[PDB]
Amino acid sequence: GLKAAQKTLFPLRSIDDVVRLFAAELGREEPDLVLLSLVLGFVEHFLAVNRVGLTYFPVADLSIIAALYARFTAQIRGAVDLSLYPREGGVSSRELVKKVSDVIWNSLSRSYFKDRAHIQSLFSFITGTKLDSSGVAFAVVGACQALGLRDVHLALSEDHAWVVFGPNGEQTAEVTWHGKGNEDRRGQTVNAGVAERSWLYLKGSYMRCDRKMEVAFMVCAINPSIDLHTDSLELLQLQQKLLWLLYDLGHLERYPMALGNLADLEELEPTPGRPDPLTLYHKGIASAKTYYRDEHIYPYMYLAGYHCRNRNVREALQAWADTATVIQDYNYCREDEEIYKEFFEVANDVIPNLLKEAASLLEAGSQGSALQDPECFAHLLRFYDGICKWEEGSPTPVLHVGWATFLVQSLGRFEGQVRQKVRIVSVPVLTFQSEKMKGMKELLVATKINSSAIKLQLTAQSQVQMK
């Protein structure tokens, strides 16, 4: 069901031919999500899943791509009868969006591993009858486009996907699952999740994609991993070129995570004449502040990781402090575990390892060490303050004694004379938001940190052992 204009670049014989196809679609009224996802999935299959016989690039012949496209459009058109679901106003109904979601869902293999790589694209849906969680939402949006439902768009948080539709684009619908052993809400709005102030729904400051941002999503969804220790250079290159195409056209302006992904690719292999990784990380953070009320966590995590990899201790700590200053205004809810895992790993593994190395390099005579900078100690404390404030008012606790051992260790990496330099001011100077950290303030400047008292203050524990 492709138009003649869409077929003139085939066969696609290189990365650059795939880029030309994406450029041509992005210059159309609406880019064809089904075409583009089939092409990416095809090239990913033969560059990452099965490279047998590869000599340069897996040539994408029009006959192959058109046949896959026709299997998809046939399946959706045959199963979704639009006359049953009248469309006033160029707006779709909830029943129609649920029907499309049901068609995709009911097409999937009954039993498979949902955490596998390379099951994100419509190539995987057609050839393997397998999709990952977010891949189901994308497929629902692709199918809706194939049906002419111009109002159906992808909605994205930092860990979930759904759709928006309807009068003025204001309706939301769940179309896929989230997590594992979680309870399916397909068909429902996202309003309870927004109202609960969970991270998963971003207090409503989630991405509402247009078709060009949906193209960006598919590009971010490229998975170059061949296995746990090898990536496809071709797919890394393709992703990187496609992200720059999107960037140049303005389609990453409202997509912080994509700017972070691009920055990460530039760190690995910089493109001459382009902005440095740091510039791109800061663009991502600016996009979150401009469009999403500064309510996103990953722009700062992206930044912090870059600094961590480059052993920039000061700037890593600053960026993780900023991560925590975002999370403090959320409630920790039942399906937010991925972000809990992220903060846990930063607090309890990554920061400790960084500080351990800094302690060895200080012993070796390093100058300007983060461990001698009271501003760094203030960032450490702001990080914990944000996590403690996150926990306030939440339906489920965050801190436990497992965190306290690392907090004491990390505090102890700064000498008392450095720690004493931070002035904790009530509403370097630091103001605490959390009641836990306010109560901890006197304990933070002792020469020898009182480990048991810190533990008591950080956790729900209020008594010491009887004997």
Partner: peptide
């Protein structure tokens, strides 16, 4: 074995 991650989530 290669695994899924949410698209453009940072880290490995």
């Amino acid at each position: 074995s290669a695994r899924w991650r949410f698209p453009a989530r940072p880290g490995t």
